[PDB]
Design a protein around this ligand. Structure first.
Ligand SMILES: Nc1ncnc2c1ncn2[C@@H]1O[C@@H]2COP(=O)(O)O[C@H]2[C@H]1O
Ligand SMILES: Nc1ncnc2c1ncn2[C@@H]1O[C@@H]2COP(=O)(O)O[C@H]2[C@H]1O
Ligand SMILES: Nc1ncnc2c1ncn2[C@@H]1O[C@@H]2COP(=O)(O)O[C@H]2[C@H]1O
Ligand SMILES: [Hg+2]
Ligand SMILES: [Hg+2]
Ligand SMILES: [Hg+2]
Lengths: 531, 531, 531
């Protein structure tokens, strides 16, 4: 009852209300501000106002369709459907006139003033009251009591379009909804938009044909108008309307005239005006179609543009053909036909979303790799936030022996081969890491690592490595243990790292459980290398 | 009198003058340079020249409309309006010829040379004097005294279009004004531009129809021209002009011919030429309409493109559906359907504008938060310039206990919950800050902070924090006091911070008023937490 | 046999399979997962499914072409080609109906579920089974046994288009292939795309003309239809079809009607509908043509835009004309009409590709320059990765004497002149370097270096220089030796560097072979300067 009424009048919490007023607490405060009126008032964001604008829109469309047909072909309409439609439109327009008093205006620059007592009424009386009044003047059944004549009277109903001109915030909300829909579905959105355009053009053709038959009627059908020429002055209204609409549509779409070219001044000038209007609207239609298509094929176009820029670079530097093919298939394997700026996206997001994304991306790595499978989640999240994606092609040398290292790698996909001066070549696969002994000893690379298949790795710089491990030293002890074991395995040895770990162990800092965990890690690594 | 004359001739201070000559002092110097002439001279930026170009434009439009109609349908015109229009156009063209002497040219590469005595006269005598002279030759009433004939004479008046070709700087100023208008109003600008295009095309149709009726007239209406075919050789000039314009417009908009297809060579070739011209101009019209629409829907298109790139990223990484929905609603709540680069904007602005903007943005924070409500404005502006906006979703963990902290947060909207190992959970709301104890003690986070509703915060890094507080130490004392109180409240204690503050207090650096203010701050914080 | 069958059903390793499933090991795992069915099943990426979709596409095109002609002009077809085509289409549609059971669906969000036993059958029974069944219902030869009539029956065959609506993954693969082709060949791609569009429009014209002749046939040719008006009710089917297609095509391309304008209600409304459809499709065609052209001229447009921005900058700063010409010819010589972001490209690539590219770019430098011609490849690759391209114009001063230096240069093309206070001017050419004595002594520049012709150099910063040389000191000794020799040559001397090298030599760190190599380097440099 009154509770539902007040709820309808008060701005309901919705996505549009949140977008316009920030927090939900502000929505509650605005509900309270509406409550401060005491006298009934509808908020420009009320669901009641939304539904009312909806029914007013459907009534305006019905009127736009029906008014010209009546004016032209129906002199007097006293049948049931005509009377009920006229009275329905009259009462609806009057109710809208009334309710436009208690409507809170919404000015720009974040200006929304209820101003129930006087400001809204005064602004409406000064702005648009007279046109809505003459619209709401009832059907000619009341004008005959107050005072071709009928055809002259009904003209006053053409200005009901101004209500549709005012009804635009609902149009903007519908445009937002349709934009969401278009981003969701591609082809359906195109179909809907082109059908909307076709509907607009068809309504214009309707009005044009109505006018083209109306004007020869206001002159009692002179002997040289197209009606008297085609001798269809006595045909039923169906044929007359059909042929008039045909003439109007042929003038719009630039097909031709009707039977023949005009011969009288009246229909001559009407034909010229209709030709101008139709040509302009068809140009607008072509423009909208071009815009729709160009918006449809955006991503493919951007991909082609990036590809062309890469081609221009390779051409400017005059690279060999095989190298160009290598660059192209590398791009194909890295981006897989897609285009985006991952750095910009990750910068736009926030910390919890980035953590969620990297955890989902490296779920399998966290599951398989032992250190992550047993470490504290804060350290895991730090490492995963510091990682960075990379792709390597078969035969490429990921690490060259002797050089200075500045990053380590975590394998996500593929197989990598480790080659030394000895014949012992060891092949790592998913869930294993390499290139950390250089980062742990500050020396040079101790072995060469070459990609055997297409490898997909996650590299970690040396600065981030040192930062994270300075924040967590026990993981550094674990890394050093695994690295010493690997070095002992290949047949080389780093006395610096060995003596450092031996001193740390003799210092008694580690516990029995600690060295047990370290033995578990080294066993797991031995298994992962043997497999 | 002479004062107003000199003021009109001298470049008036306006937005265009400022844009062209930098400082207002340069405008005064150019006024002086004009004064150095001694002989009267109009500056190419004078309001007098502006008004003169305006009236010359309206006269050129009147001539473009009237000349062909006269030439074609009016053999001799001795009535009052015709005579007055001819003499008006003649005197106006002659006055423009005269005033083009004392006009200072404006070359490119910042070249504006008054050069009153000789250079302007010589350049005009060498450039365009003869065509303007033959234009300014008076109406045929003087040519008959000097020496179909009339129709041959009036041709000399067609070259008045060259004056309109010269009048282009006023066109550029009008284009600037219309660009401002178009940036201001959207739909009105589109209506104005399409009406301008339609007017151009209609003027072309006018000239085309005039020619199409003129040529059969110069041949005494042969029996096979369209005029003699339609037997309208004797009709009043109204009907002839109407039907000729109809033929021209049907040829342009590609509807058809007139009554029937041409049958004679003359009108055959004229029809082909008119068809070519009309098709070209309609193609140009379609192009302009497409450009206008595509410029109308720019921002929506850019928003759609960014959304599509985010979608492509999420697809390349194969994220779950709920995570994709979370990303999308986060974007919706962060940007609210708008698109801009805040970093680039703030980099484009300057320091006072940035200070103004951040002060307006954080007005409520400065009002509510006690430290800012009592501190020195320089410190307040430093902090507000260092802040950075952020958005969090409900349930997200803003701060996880035990981790290392690198920023603090100031709440602008929403509610945040503080959870510890104890059951004491404390809820902060607008105007409160958290996450500073880690920055003050260089330890770890002492509690977990989780967003309860959609939170909108302003984060401050640790480097900027330390910089600002090294510039202002008393605020650091206040922060430390509030932090010690909060720690004591939750039930934990940091002996390092406690002993540091105790030593600073025993050092006698603080005053009675100082500790009074600190007690006020701690009381206000207790109230803000209790509420 | 069965081996080839299982191979066809299992997803073959291809570029699309790799793009959809990452590593080849995943492709093998999916082959195994298909093997887990036990009951035969085709994978949505099987080459068998590809070939089947191909033959179904050709059958659908044949049906789209043949069905309307039959329905309209061929009452009963009992000849050999008609019967064989009908039975072929029937069996093909039935086989597709059958095979759509064992087809694994492919949902979005990385969802590919074989689900052989029940899920696929249930989903197909709930989704699209009935329409495919009524399609697969055989030709009317079976419907007559089961129960104008013929023309009523064959309508059931129009819904075979739904199969073409389903066949879209093959369309996407063909679109990928055509995108590769379009990136490869420019003009051929445009020709193919416009021919595709023309084919679509022609098929639509075909259906439209078929309908336009069909409707007057279903009414026994009333006396006022266009057929009875043109008296072609008795002509052979060739002429009737030709004239109907002519009417439809004239309605689409907006030429006109047929003989004359319609006179009856039926063909009146059919003409209006056909006009609407044709205008819409021609608008779509114009849109696609505009998009194709705009995609064709992309790179030229981007180059023009960058040029215009440079022009706007130079205009805003009001630079002289000769300076503007200098800027423009510098741009012409630096980028050579091409446009790309080398930094972004090199950031997108990886380390081995970057090493390959820089090695190919500086091959001649490595060949000619002695230090690189004798040094270790790791040092060479470090230097080449640190270098950076630069271009200088004739007369420009590359290095001014006395100033502080922050980079050295390696000449790739051109000649440079070295000027001192003495008259000894020495000219360096390709393969020589300069500007290292400042970097080695931390003093000031010891001579001026001016470009004589258009120079193309590779500059190396001072930080990278010091980093690389701290990683490799012997090369620093070589640089110092060459620099001391050059200084002694010009007539100046740096006692600091001289004494440092003398102390290093007296320290006995160098070997006989080492100083032999150094003598070789200094001899080679003397030769390169003398030449
Ligand atoms: N036995 C081994 N098994 C697996 N990986 C190894 C082995 N020995 C060395 N590596 C890795 O190969 C890398 C080569 O360079 P680094 O010495 O920087 O670090 C080395 C380790 O990451
Ligand atoms: N009693 C409290 N009331 C409000 N906020 C608190 C309280 N105790 C701790 N906090 C905040 O919670 C944060 C958790 O991490 P920090 O220790 O970095 O800094 C802490 C303070 O900002
Ligand atoms: N005799 C020479 N031959 C070639 N180049 C020289 C000679 N003397 C000096 N240079 C170069 O000219 C440079 C001028 O500045 P720098 O002293 O930094 O380093 C100097 C050398 O690179
Ligand atoms: Hg109305
Ligand atoms: Hg003139
Ligand atoms: Hg079929």
């Amino acid at each position: 009852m009154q509770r539902q009424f007040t709820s309808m009048l008060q701005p309901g919490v919705n996505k549009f209300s949140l977008r316009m007023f920030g927090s939900q607490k502000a929505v509650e405060k605005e509900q309270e501000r509406v409550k401060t009126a005491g006298f009934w008032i509808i908020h420009p964001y009320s669901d009641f106002r939304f539904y009312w604008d909806l029914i007013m829109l459907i009534m305006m469309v019905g009127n736009l369709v029906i008014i010209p047909v009546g004016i032209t072909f129906f002199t007097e309409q006293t049948t049931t459907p005509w009377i009920i439609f006229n009275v329905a439109s009259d009462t609806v327009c009057l109710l809208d006139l009334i309710m436009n008093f208690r409507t809170g205006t919404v000015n720009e620059d974040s200006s929304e003033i209820i101003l129930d007592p006087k400001v809204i009424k005064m602004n409406y009386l000064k702005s648009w009251f007279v046109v809505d009044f003459i619209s709401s003047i009832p059907v000619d059944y009341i004008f005959l009591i107050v005072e071709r004549a009928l055809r002259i009277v009904r003209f006053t109903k053409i200005l009901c379009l101004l209500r549709l001109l005012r009804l635009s915030r609902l149009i903007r909300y519908i445009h937002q909804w349709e934009e969401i829909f278009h981003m969701t579905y591609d082809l359906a959105s195109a179909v809907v938009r082109i059908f909307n355009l076709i509907g607009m053009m068809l309504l214009l053709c309707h009005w044009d044909g109505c006018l083209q038959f109306l004007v020869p009627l206001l002159q009692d059908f002179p002997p040289d108008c197209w009606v008297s020429l085609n001798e269809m002055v006595n045909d039923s209204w169906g044929k007359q309307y059909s042929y008039a609409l045909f003439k109007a549509m042929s003038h719009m779409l630039c097909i031709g005239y009707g039977a023949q070219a005009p011969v009288s001044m009246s229909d001559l000038w009407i034909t010229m005006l209709s030709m101008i209007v139709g040509a302009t609207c068809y140009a607008m239609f072509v423009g909208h179609a071009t815009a729709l298509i160009q918006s449809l094929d955006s991503s493919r176009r951007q991909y082609q543009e990036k590809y062309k820029q890469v081609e221009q670079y390779m051409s400017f530097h005059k690279l060999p053909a095989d190298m160009r093919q290598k660059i192209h298939d590398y791009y194909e394997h890295r981006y897989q036909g897609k285009i985006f700026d991952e750095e910009n996206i990750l910068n736009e997001l926030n910390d919890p979303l980035r953590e969620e994304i990297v955890n989902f991306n490296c779920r399998k790595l966290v599951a398989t790799m032992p250190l992550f499978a047993n470490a504290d989640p804060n350290f895991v999240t730090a490492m995963l936030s510091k990682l960075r994606f990379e792709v390597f092609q078969p035969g490429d040398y990921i690490i060259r022996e002797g050089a200075v290292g500045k990053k380590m790698y975590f394998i996500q996909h593929g197989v990598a081969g480790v080659i030394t001066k000895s014949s012992k070549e060891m092949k790592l696969t998913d869930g294993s890491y390499f290139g950390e002994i250089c980062l742990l000893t500050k020396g040079r690379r101790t072995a060469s690592v070459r990609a055997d298949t297409y490898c997909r790795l996650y590299s970690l710089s040396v600065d981030n490595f040192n930062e994270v491990l300075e924040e967590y030293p026990m993981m550094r002890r674990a890394f050093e243990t695994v690295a010493i074991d690997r070095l002992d395995r290949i047949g080389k040895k780093n006395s610096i790292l060995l003596q450092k770990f031996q001193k740390d162990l003799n210092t008694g800092v580690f516990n029995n459980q600690e060295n047990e965990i370290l033995k578990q890690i080294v066993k797991h690594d031995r298994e992962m290398v043997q497999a």
